[PDB]
Design a binder for this molecule. Sequence first.
Ligand SMILES: OC[C@H]1O[C@@H](O[C@@H]2[C@@H](O)[C@H](O[C@@H]3[C@@H](O)[C@H](O)O[C@H](CO)[C@H]3O)O[C@H](CO)[C@H]2O)[C@H](O)[C@@H](O)[C@@H]1O
Ligand SMILES: OC[C@H]1O[C@@H](O[C@@H]2[C@@H](O)[C@H](O)O[C@H](CO)[C@H]2O)[C@H](O)[C@@H](O)[C@@H]1O
Length: 247
Amino acid sequence: HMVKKRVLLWDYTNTRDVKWAMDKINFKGPLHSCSNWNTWYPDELKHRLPFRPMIHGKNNLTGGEWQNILKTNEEVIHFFNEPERAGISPEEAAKIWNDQVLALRTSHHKRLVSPSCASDPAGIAWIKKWMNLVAKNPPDYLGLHWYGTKGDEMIRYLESMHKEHPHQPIIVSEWASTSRSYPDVLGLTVQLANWMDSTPWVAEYALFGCMRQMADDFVSPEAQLMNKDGSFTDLMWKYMSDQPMHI
Ligand SMILES: OC[C@H]1O[C@@H](O[C@@H]2[C@@H](O)[C@H](O[C@@H]3[C@@H](O)[C@H](O)O[C@H](CO)[C@H]3O)O[C@H](CO)[C@H]2O)[C@H](O)[C@@H](O)[C@@H]1O
Ligand SMILES: OC[C@H]1O[C@@H](O[C@@H]2[C@@H](O)[C@H](O)O[C@H](CO)[C@H]2O)[C@H](O)[C@@H](O)[C@@H]1O
């Protein structure tokens, strides 16, 4: 049976500039859901996959941003994106969770993803502290990011975080190879897709790079899932079409 755990990360620049690109997505392959780092829904999706709204940061707790979260028909909602790098302490995020976000479960019966921190000591320590602070009202999923060049190290990290936090499944809300060598990008992507596909405690995983411009200097141009014209790279085709993935 077709294993369907792959998330379509749909950056708002796609919605802003190249809506039409969504209609070129393959929906008959292992794509299973969609997120866009925002509270609001990408209309061009036309409900062809479940959407996970995100409470990205403190700017998304009030006004029309919070109204989008309160009114959504979608089942799963992400909390803060890399809060350890936006000056949000574990204690401050635990308070906002109890006072405001938890109601989305107790009252609106949504499932909640923990904040997704970076795979560095600062991030590992942040999520360790926050999960302890809200242990009496834990999240439904543990949200993880991972960027690097060695697939064996991402596997060891997921296995490591699953042992440290064994009470819920893991969502990899962002991951990618940062290698500038395309064979090493393709090799890691294929390895981790197939490994996570056959690992029950990984609910879903979200490959980064489906946008026209480079996000920053950190991510690899060889790992891009969209060309500058808005067409899809061969890596994107394989991601959304092939199960198992192959090089
Ligand atoms: O700051 C730029 C960029 O950083 C991203 O986080 C990275 C981590 O992905 C990276 O992870 C390392 C792995 O690549 C490596 O294989 O293993 C080590 C541990 O042995 C990991 O730490 O670590 C660096 C810190 O040196 C982080 O910068 C963020 O997710 C991203 O948002 C940001 O753009
Ligand atoms: O096989 C998993 C690992 O793949 C590595 O890339 C390989 C390259 O080093 C080599 O040159 O080519 C093969 C395919 O011909 C690649 O698979 C990645 O660099 C690793 O991160 C990954 O774990």
